[PDB]
């Protein structure tokens, strides 16, 4: 029991909590993928990372509201986090925001604004955004 894959996951936690707070590549993704972290702790960790202006952290926190499985579904608060993420130059953050803006999902429907968000997401490396445009 003290050498299992679950023990190694427990040990990786604090490491990825740091990585996620500092927005290092794949750092919040690793938290999201880590089965030894329950959703409440995860929410706590992404919330602290987004408060530290981790673009990835906001982008993943946004999903909890968008989904409404672990916290009550709230499209508007989901969009606020995706927007905060995009403002922090998060590639996925701007892409997701542009889909929400084009549909009016949790934000006012605004295709013109969406097109500009997509141009930014494309500038940040989103091929999908570049192709939509």
UniProtKB/Swiss-Prot annotation:
Keyword field: Antibiotic resistance, Disulfide bond, Hydrolase, Repeat, TPR repeat
Domain of life per record: Bacteria
Lyase among keywords: no
Catalytic activity: a beta-lactam + H2O = a substituted beta-amino acid
Pfam families associated with the record: Sel1 (PF08238)
SUPFAM superfamilies on file: HCP-like
Disulfide cysteine pairs (residue numbers): 20-28, 50-58, 86-94, 122-130
Repeat region (TPR), residues: 1-26, 55-92, 95-128
Top-level EC class as recorded in UniProt: hydrolase
A single GO molecular function term of this UniProt record: beta-lactamase activity
GO biological process: response to antibiotic
PANTHER family noted in UniProt: CYTOCHROME C OXIDASE ASSEMBLY FACTOR 7
Annotated function: Hydrolyzes 6-aminopenicillinic acid and 7-aminocephalosporanic acid (ACA) derivatives.
Miscellaneous information on this protein: Antibodies against HcpB are present in sera from human patients infected by Helicobacter pylori.
Protein name: Beta-lactamase HcpB
Gene, per the UniProt record: hcpB
């Amino acid at each position: 029991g003290g050498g299992t894959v679950k023990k190694d996951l427990k040990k990786a936690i604090q490491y990825y909590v740091k990585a996620c707070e500092l927005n290092e590549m794949f750092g919040c993704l690793s938290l999201v993928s880590n089965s030894q972290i329950n959703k409440q702790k995860l929410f706590q960790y992404l919330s602290k990372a987004c408060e530290l202006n981790s673009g990835n952290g906001c982008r993943f926190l946004g999903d909890f509201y968008e989904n409404g499985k672990y916290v009550k579904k709230d499209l508007r608060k989901a969009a606020q986090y995706y927007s905060k993420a995009c403002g922090l130059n998060d590639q996925d953050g701007c892409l997701i925001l542009g889909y929400k803006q084009y549909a009016g999902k949790g934000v006012v429907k605004n295709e013109k604004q969406a097109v500009k968000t997509f141009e930014k997401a494309c500038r940040l490396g989103s091929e999908d955004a570049c192709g939509i445009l």
